[PDB]
Amino acid sequence: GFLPHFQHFATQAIHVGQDPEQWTSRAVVPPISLSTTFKQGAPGQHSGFEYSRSGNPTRNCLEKAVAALDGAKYCLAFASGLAATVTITHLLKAGDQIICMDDVYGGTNRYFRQVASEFGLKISFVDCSKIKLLEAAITPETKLVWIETPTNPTQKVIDIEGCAHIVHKHGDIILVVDNTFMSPYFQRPLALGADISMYSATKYMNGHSDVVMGLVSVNCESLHNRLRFLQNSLGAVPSPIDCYLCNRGLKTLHVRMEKHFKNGMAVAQFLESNPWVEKVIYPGLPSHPQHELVKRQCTGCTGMVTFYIKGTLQHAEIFLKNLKLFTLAESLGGFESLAELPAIMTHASVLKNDRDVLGISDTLIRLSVGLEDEEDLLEDLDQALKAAH
Amino acid sequence: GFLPHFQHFATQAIHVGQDPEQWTSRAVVPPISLSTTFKQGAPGQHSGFEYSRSGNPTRNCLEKAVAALDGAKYCLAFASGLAATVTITHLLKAGDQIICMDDVYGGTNRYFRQVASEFGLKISFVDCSKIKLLEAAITPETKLVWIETPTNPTQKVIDIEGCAHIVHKHGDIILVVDNTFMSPYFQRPLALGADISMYSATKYMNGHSDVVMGLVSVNCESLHNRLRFLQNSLGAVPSPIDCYLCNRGLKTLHVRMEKHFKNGMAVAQFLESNPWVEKVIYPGLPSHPQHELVKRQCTGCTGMVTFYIKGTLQHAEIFLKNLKLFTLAESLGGFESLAELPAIMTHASVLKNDRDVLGISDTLIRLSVGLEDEEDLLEDLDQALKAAHP
Amino acid sequence: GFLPHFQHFATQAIHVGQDPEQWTSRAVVPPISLSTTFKQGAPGQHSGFEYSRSGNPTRNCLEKAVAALDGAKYCLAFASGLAATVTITHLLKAGDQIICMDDVYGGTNRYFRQVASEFGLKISFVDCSKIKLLEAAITPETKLVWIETPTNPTQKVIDIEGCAHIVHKHGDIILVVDNTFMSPYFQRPLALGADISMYSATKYMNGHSDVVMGLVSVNCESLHNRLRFLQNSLGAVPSPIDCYLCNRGLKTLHVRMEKHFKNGMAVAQFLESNPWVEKVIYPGLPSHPQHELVKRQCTGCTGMVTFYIKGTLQHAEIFLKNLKLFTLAESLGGFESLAELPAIMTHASVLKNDRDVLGISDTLIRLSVGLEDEEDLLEDLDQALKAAH
Amino acid sequence: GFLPHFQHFATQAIHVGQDPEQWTSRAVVPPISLSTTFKQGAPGQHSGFEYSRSGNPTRNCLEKAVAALDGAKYCLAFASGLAATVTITHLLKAGDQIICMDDVYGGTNRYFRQVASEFGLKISFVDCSKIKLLEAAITPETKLVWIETPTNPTQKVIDIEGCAHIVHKHGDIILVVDNTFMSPYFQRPLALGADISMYSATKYMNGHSDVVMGLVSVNCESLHNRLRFLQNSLGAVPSPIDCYLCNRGLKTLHVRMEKHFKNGMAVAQFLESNPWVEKVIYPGLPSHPQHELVKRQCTGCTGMVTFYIKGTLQHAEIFLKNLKLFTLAESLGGFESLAELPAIMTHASVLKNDRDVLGISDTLIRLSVGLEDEEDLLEDLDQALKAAH
Ligand SMILES: C=C(NCc1c(COP(=O)(O)O)cnc(C)c1O)C(=O)O
Ligand SMILES: C=C(NCc1c(COP(=O)(O)O)cnc(C)c1O)C(=O)O
Numbered sequence A, C, D: 001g002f003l004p005h006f007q008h009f010a011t012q013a014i015h016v017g018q019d020p021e022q023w024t025s026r027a028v029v030p031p032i033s034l035s036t037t038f039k040q041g042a043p044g045q046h047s048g049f050e051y052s053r054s055g056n057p058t059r060n061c062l063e064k065a066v067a068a069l070d071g072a073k074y075c076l077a078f079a080s081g082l083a084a085t086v087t088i089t090h091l092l093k094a095g096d097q098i099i100c101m102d103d104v105y106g107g108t109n110r111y112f113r114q115v116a117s118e119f120g121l122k123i124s125f126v127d128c129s130k131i132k133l134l135e136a137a138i139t140p141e142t143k144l145v146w147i148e149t150p151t152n153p154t155q156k157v158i159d160i161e162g163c164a165h166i167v168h169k170h171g172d173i174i175l176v177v178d179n180t181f182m183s184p185y186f187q188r189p190l191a192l193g194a195d196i197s198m199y200s201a202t203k204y205m206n207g208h209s210d211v212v213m214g215l216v217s218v219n220c221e222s223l224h225n226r227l228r229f230l231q232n233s234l235g236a237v238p239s240p241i242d243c244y245l246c247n248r249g250l251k252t253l254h255v256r257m258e259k260h261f262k263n264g265m266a267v268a269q270f271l272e273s274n275p276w277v278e279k280v281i282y283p284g285l286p287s288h289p290q291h292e293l294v295k296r297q298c299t300g301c302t303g304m305v306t307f308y309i310k311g312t313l314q315h316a317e318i319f320l321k322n323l324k325l326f327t328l329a330e331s332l333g334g335f336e337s338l339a340e341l342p343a344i345m346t347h348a349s350v351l352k353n354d355r356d357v358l359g360i361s362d363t364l365i366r367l368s369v370g371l372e373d374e375e376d377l378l379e380d381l382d383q384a385l386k387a388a389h
Numbered sequence B: 001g002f003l004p005h006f007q008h009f010a011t012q013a014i015h016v017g018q019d020p021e022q023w024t025s026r027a028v029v030p031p032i033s034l035s036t037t038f039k040q041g042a043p044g045q046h047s048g049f050e051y052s053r054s055g056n057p058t059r060n061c062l063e064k065a066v067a068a069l070d071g072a073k074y075c076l077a078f079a080s081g082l083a084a085t086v087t088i089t090h091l092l093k094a095g096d097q098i099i100c101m102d103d104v105y106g107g108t109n110r111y112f113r114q115v116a117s118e119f120g121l122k123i124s125f126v127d128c129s130k131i132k133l134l135e136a137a138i139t140p141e142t143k144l145v146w147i148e149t150p151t152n153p154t155q156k157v158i159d160i161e162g163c164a165h166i167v168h169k170h171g172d173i174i175l176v177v178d179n180t181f182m183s184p185y186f187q188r189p190l191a192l193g194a195d196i197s198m199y200s201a202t203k204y205m206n207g208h209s210d211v212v213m214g215l216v217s218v219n220c221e222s223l224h225n226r227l228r229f230l231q232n233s234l235g236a237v238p239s240p241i242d243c244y245l246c247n248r249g250l251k252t253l254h255v256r257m258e259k260h261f262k263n264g265m266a267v268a269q270f271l272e273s274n275p276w277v278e279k280v281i282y283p284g285l286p287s288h289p290q291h292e293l294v295k296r297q298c299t300g301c302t303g304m305v306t307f308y309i310k311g312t313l314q315h316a317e318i319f320l321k322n323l324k325l326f327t328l329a330e331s332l333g334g335f336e337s338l339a340e341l342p343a344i345m346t347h348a349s350v351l352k353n354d355r356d357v358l359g360i361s362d363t364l365i366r367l368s369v370g371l372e373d374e375e376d377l378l379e380d381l382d383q384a385l386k387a388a389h390p
């Protein structure tokens, strides 16, 4: 009962930006152009490229593809997901206010809380999953609302169309949705009212655990020109090879995400059936408080499964150490299955008190279910939970 | 009469951070580690690496090498030179003031003037080549002094130790020297009092016109920890492959820069003796107003040659179009020779009024002399100058 | 009614040879080791590597993975598919005989006929699809039988178990199966009696149209030692980067091949019911003469679809140029859909007389169906066939 | 008093094949084109590229550059130096004869001796440094003469122009010069009568110890077409990235080779004056038996320094081991200094009887002097010789 899948997604992921007529050789795969500079027929009159930081063939090809997958007009690539957040923040000026989602990636919390706040910006963390709390927190100085859905790691879900309703009542407020967890194959924030669709491409977009990159998709002409200026002026740009490698991962995004769905759902149901699991948070399960909201704004779910182990910190540790197929490591969205304890690793940059209020306890385990065989993944979780029973 | 060359430079550029025993294969060249994450034996108990953005083998190898070449204790790599400038600015707080050299790369001027100033920072452009003009502009809110030497493109030279004397006289003020034009083989700002040695690694460090990268070297422990926090928190980090490629270019930095010196000097002398060149700005020529300061502050000179062609824009254009070996393009520091007209291209982001005050006119041409054969470079300039003045 | 899928394929494709414990950094993805040489603890006493051509970390990791996907003990990577064919041919001696499948890739035909024959080797092309023709052609000097199944481009299918029975009655004959068209996810020649499972990894193994590489899997110890000697001695070795890129593509082989199956079947059925197609050759259709052998010998089929257009050379040409999503080009097995005219392009190296005997006519069109959206692929073929008629 | 340096060498190494107008972007550095295939406007009507193995932009750019540096009309790149040797051998036919230099790289001797000889080719090893023995050994079946100069590792020098005179009196005999040790910056075999200038590009050509590659430069039109046919037909082709990396190393060949000369000479003079060195073989020293011949055909010398340690095998082992800056490893020609004992390491593939007759004894040490600071390289040799006395 999910949203119908996006129509030409697979065809566009393979061909947008990959036109052979772009190259003299008519190659079917875009070449990796490392050249920092380009010949000009006259001072200031180039043939499309002046300097790699401002633009280069391999990066523009990637931006073209991601924009199409997001239903966007424009896209911008950056050195990392955080670098995209920083560049987006530079759209503002001293005196502006930012409303940020309550549960967000540790680095996003760390940046807003400890860095951006020191340059004339007020940061307010609000649980926008309760949509009235967002409306109450908006102020005449609010210029940017930063949303994750599902949130990392508690996986709270936010009505994007509802928030866009509210946020756009006050005129000039930018709504950003960090769509890293879902990918554009399952959720298109721009089609739901958002002004900016942002990704940590390190996770699902690239999907091969070998490229650190951020992506930002936008439709507004004014908003794109401002973001493009900061891409060149701040210089947090990605390598053209990383762009090629990321564009390479997009070619299989559709088949990868579909398998993440099946394996993730199978893992979530198994964990809810386990006598040694206290709670399971997965947007695809009916037990999720926003399950029905997911189906109206998403075409499916991913392999990100969060759950609470029964017991204490030492039971969580024992489970993670007895894993033989899941790998104890940070990050997510790759072909290999990964397991982690956010309170001690990825979300240790969040204040401990803020962890407790959010539920990020010592027993919260986050899983990034990969593309391995289903029964092998379930046999690994079973043996490791039994080890920690 | 230049400074004696820095000892062990070549050996360190080839071996620092390149320890074969680091790898199970015991390879002599460090592998390219693309992995975004690393397996941990226990929650939070890694093997040296947690996440690629925080750190990764190939990037750490590069940073160590640069640190040794700069005589620094630590170094940080970034996605670009500007990204290093932005990260350095984030060391400050709203209300602080930045003093920037009046003549600087257009993008540096653009960032400070149009971006950093909008976040509670006041920017003042002052001619720190006159070292007393800097002393007058310092205020209790001054936290950062950003200088280029030689400046881009006018190539004004600044007594780094002189500025360091003044700057450190007022307590907690950071002195940054953008050492892009000279490279550590010819100038070590840290040994001259500077607090931060910063590079656009896109130019000479990599030296192969195929990597966009910035580098920041530092000695102060407090200053390093704050920069490292911002490297991971702002995430303007370079690709591990770019890190490998840049470390690859470092291996020939010493032999590349020496040839840049010879070709650059030969081009400057040819242009100075040319009847259709009004003036030549090259730190290696005695005609440069700060020549003796250069020999006092550098072990040599670079391939960056600036000069004024005789006539008007119309002659500047024609000269550039008749070039057959020099390439009309932006950037610099590569093995290939490059020519440009800053007022319209790299420094078009600078306001015309400040361009005029700085001397960046329609006849100022900037050359990045490459590693081609000397005779071919001089014949291309000769043929192009004659073409512009028949 | 196909063979049941191979157990643990996906798990092995993602993890075999990728153990993080190999690296000091504990990286989850193997690094790309470009170093040509390695430090030795003593003159001639290495720690596993002395020189890149003999072996290097990134290549050895890939070989382990491919061997597992083939169920093999050993695997060897090469600079190209032909480079693997040449290296295998060097296993023999002057005076030996080679029996090659009559319908084979043009370059493979060119090598045996025009090169290997000039160095004391007798080459015999036999229709091994009739198993008695192989038995009749075996000679006391026969040392190598080289088979493709399905063949390129006519896609004749060969009973691997039948040929192994025949070939191995005579003692010292090597049976090679070029498994390029099927990939190890759908066909395991080694489990069916073959002595060597060989691939042009340029096609499906890498699957991203950006790596030229060959792979050879083997079980026999004597046969492996002889091949390993020639890998280092002939030096037709691949770059460690290409090895990394190919190993990256292997991680999604299972999900890619499943989509190739679905898209290939849909395209093959559409063409067979098309009024401007005289004949369709697809192992997955019941109309294929060896359909029942395919289901007995394969777990599925791929996106390689061959068909004869009705009319003349001019109708094939017009059809091929009016394709707007399929790309007219050589090669196959990538995420993008490809079309070609073998008689003029990939198989122009086969003698015209031999083309007619094999059926490689001016109206035979070969398709490599990619992973694009199904309806877009069928709509591109529909509009292009009308354009020709 | 050497030959004058080759004119326009540096300019050509930086610009030949690197023309920005080749690319729509007008990039100053050629892009890395990984695409295996290319779009064709009509069946068999390409725009210069059909399939990566036959040709691709990044490889063709490299081939143009090397050809110019060799003073050649054509150049062909291969997966390795041995792969280039194999491809050149396939130029012949069963019944032909090969004359190979008596002292040659272990792998080159091993290939001819143990592989090529098994396919209807007779191999004859002759000391062509004494030119009368070459004239005597030629036979009506001789079709190819293969020389190294300086030889590896004894570094005997061969009058290339003299041998070309002899071999070309007998009509259709190919003269190959493996110019690996000298690089085209110091020796141009083609300008001295050779028919083929061949390189192991892994050594000085690339010069960064991270690319395994072979190169062959030729002037004869018939000979080039035959080699080009075999490049595509045997498929021992290099990766396009390796081609880019090798072309990148070429840009600094001139400045690298000059420093190898200076450091090599200083090391050769130091070791010859060292009380615990029995002999020093360096083409640049007056003590070299063919020193005056070197100055006749070369513009300079390299960092390859061979010498005999005074004493026994055990002193050579200890010497290699106490080096703290030189690295004990195989290969040569990189920016880093390398030490090895060929009799057991690189030349262990040569038969002992042939080793003893050639002088490759247990006390012969081969050094590849890098680009490190001269004074540090000389104490590394000083301290290590002191330790072994
Ligand atoms: C590091 C992981 N996430 C980083 C992240 C980021 C930051 O992306 P970077 O590529 O690490 O800069 C942004 N958005 C979301 C939703 C994220 O989860 C993690 O949770 O392991
Ligand atoms: C692009 C040019 N310079 C960039 C530059 C930079 C910026 O570096 P990037 O890597 O391009 O971000 C910093 N410092 C100096 C002295 C510079 O010249 C140029 O002058 O052509």
Ligand SMILES: C=C(NCc1c(COP(=O)(O)O)cnc(C)c1O)C(=O)O
Binding pocket: C080, C081, C082, C083, C105, C107, C108, C148, C152, C178, C180, C181, C199, C200, C201, C202, C212, C213, C214, C330, C331, C332, C346, D053, D235
């Ligand atoms: C080039 C295509 N085939 C190459 C090929 C090869 C040659 O592999 P290469 O890696 O392309 O050299 C071997 N075996 C089969 C079955 C093949 O199809 C083609 O038909 O377009």
Ligand SMILES: C=C(NCc1c(COP(=O)(O)O)cnc(C)c1O)C(=O)O
Binding pocket: C053, C235, D080, D081, D082, D083, D105, D107, D108, D148, D152, D178, D180, D181, D199, D200, D201, D202, D212, D213, D214, D330, D331, D332, D346
């Ligand atoms: C491996 C070294 N030489 C390889 C070599 C080769 C073999 O080339 P490869 O690229 O290593 O396959 C060919 N010719 C000469 C003169 C060589 O020296 C060595 O001596 O360590």
